[PDB]
Design an enzyme around this catalytic site. Structure first.
Site, PDB file in Angstrom:
ATOM      1  N   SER A 100     -13.004  18.133   0.709  1.00  0.00           N
ATOM      2  CA  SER A 100     -13.500  17.361   1.819  1.00  0.00           C
ATOM      3  C   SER A 100     -15.011  17.622   1.961  1.00  0.00           C
ATOM      4  O   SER A 100     -15.715  17.353   1.126  1.00  0.00           O
ATOM      5  CB  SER A 100     -12.619  17.643   3.053  1.00  0.00           C
ATOM      6  OG  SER A 100     -12.611  16.550   3.974  1.00  0.00           O
TER       7      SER A 100
ATOM      8  N   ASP B  87      -5.043   9.158   2.397  1.00  0.00           N
ATOM      9  CA  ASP B  87      -5.939   9.996   3.175  1.00  0.00           C
ATOM     10  C   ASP B  87      -6.385   9.244   4.412  1.00  0.00           C
ATOM     11  O   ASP B  87      -6.860   8.190   4.317  1.00  0.00           O
ATOM     12  CB  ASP B  87      -7.174  10.372   2.277  1.00  0.00           C
ATOM     13  CG  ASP B  87      -7.955  11.570   2.821  1.00  0.00           C
ATOM     14  OD1 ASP B  87      -8.098  11.740   3.988  1.00  0.00           O
ATOM     15  OD2 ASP B  87      -8.447  12.306   2.018  1.00  0.00           O
TER      16      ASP B  87
ATOM     17  N   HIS C 263      -4.774  14.028   3.074  1.00  0.00           N
ATOM     18  CA  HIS C 263      -6.084  14.652   2.882  1.00  0.00           C
ATOM     19  C   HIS C 263      -5.993  15.999   2.165  1.00  0.00           C
ATOM     20  O   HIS C 263      -6.940  16.397   1.477  1.00  0.00           O
ATOM     21  CB  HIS C 263      -6.747  14.800   4.251  1.00  0.00           C
ATOM     22  CG  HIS C 263      -8.174  15.260   4.216  1.00  0.00           C
ATOM     23  ND1 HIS C 263      -9.147  14.654   3.448  1.00  0.00           N
ATOM     24  CD2 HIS C 263      -8.803  16.228   4.925  1.00  0.00           C
ATOM     25  CE1 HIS C 263     -10.309  15.250   3.667  1.00  0.00           C
ATOM     26  NE2 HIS C 263     -10.125  16.211   4.556  1.00  0.00           N
TER      27      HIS C 263
END
Length: 268
Positions: free
Chosen positions: A134, A180, A211
């Protein structure tokens, strides 16, 4: 004769790359009071054969080493020195994450020259790569843009405040997670991928993924770990024994979208 001085290990197979463990025994140590980041665990192979490249991996916002830990043993057992870090603050932003990622590589390099360190003499400090989740993924992309000597990048579910990484020349594999909802693929991973016109690059979207689809404990360690190791080997070690594994579309139901560029298995 083996004419590539960076080649380590046996000739790979799909099964040997899908296994939980590579050929090399892995040990670890933690870095106390690190230089420029919060915490770090260093994973290394004790019998690789020769010096190996170094990889620094950064977690996402609010996240800790636990989220990315699985990569440590997985990559190290194939011949890499890997440092998983905690950031100075769990709330650090992508630019800060990139700085701390590069600080962790720098410390790995200094440790290589520290006689008391378990990785003394184990690292080729001219061969480095970056990974992260991320914001940590975004941070990896920033690291690649700012440090073009990095040999490879393999971020997962990346996010950054920018999607324009058109200056990146580092071979970059992006793991994306199909469903996601934190960093949607359509607004983050795919555009980041599309922006890169100067590099070998790949986009691998995990079918049904959330995610956290490439984090520790994921259901696709075999594929993700095969692809991560193959990418790092192909581009950090210049190891053409991994050409197919690195560039191929894994002919897998686990993959919902696959894209690659400047990663050819053909001759024209």
């Amino acid at each position: 004769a083996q004419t590539n001085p960076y080649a380590r290990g046996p000739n790979p197979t799909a099964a040997s790359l899908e296994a939980s463990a590579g050929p090399f025994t892995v040990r670890s140590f933690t870095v106390s009071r690190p230089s420029g980041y919060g915490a770090g665990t260093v994973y290394y192979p004790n019998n690789a054969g020769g010096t190996v490249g170094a990889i620094a991996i950064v977690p996402g916002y609010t996240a800790r080493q636990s989220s990315i830990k699985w990569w440590g043993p997985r990559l190290a057992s194939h011949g890499f020195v890997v440092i998983t870090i905690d950031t100075n603050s769990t709330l650090d932003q992508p630019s800060s994450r990139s700085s701390q990622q590069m600080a962790a590589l720098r410390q790995v390099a200094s440790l290589n020259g520290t006689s008391s360190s378990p990785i003394y003499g184990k690292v080729d400090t001219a061969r480095m790569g970056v990974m992260g989740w991320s914001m940590g993924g975004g941070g990896s992309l920033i690291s690649a843009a700012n440090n073009p000597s990095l040999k490879a990048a393999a971020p997962q579910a990346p996010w950054d405040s920018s999607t324009n990484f058109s200056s990146v020349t580092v071979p970059t594999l992006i793991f994306a997670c199909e469903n996601d909802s934190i960093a949607p693929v359509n607004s983050s991973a795919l555009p980041i991928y599309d922006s890169m016109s100067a590099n070998a690059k790949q986009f691998l979207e995990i079918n049904g993924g959330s995610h956290s689809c490439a984090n520790s404990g994921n259901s696709n360690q075999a594929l993700i770990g095969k692809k991560g190791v193959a990418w790092m080997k192909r581009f950090m070690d210049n190891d053409t024994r991994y050409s197919t594994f690195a560039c191929e579309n894994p002919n897998s139901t686990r993959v919902s979208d696959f894209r690659t560029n400047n990663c050819s298995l053909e001759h024209h």
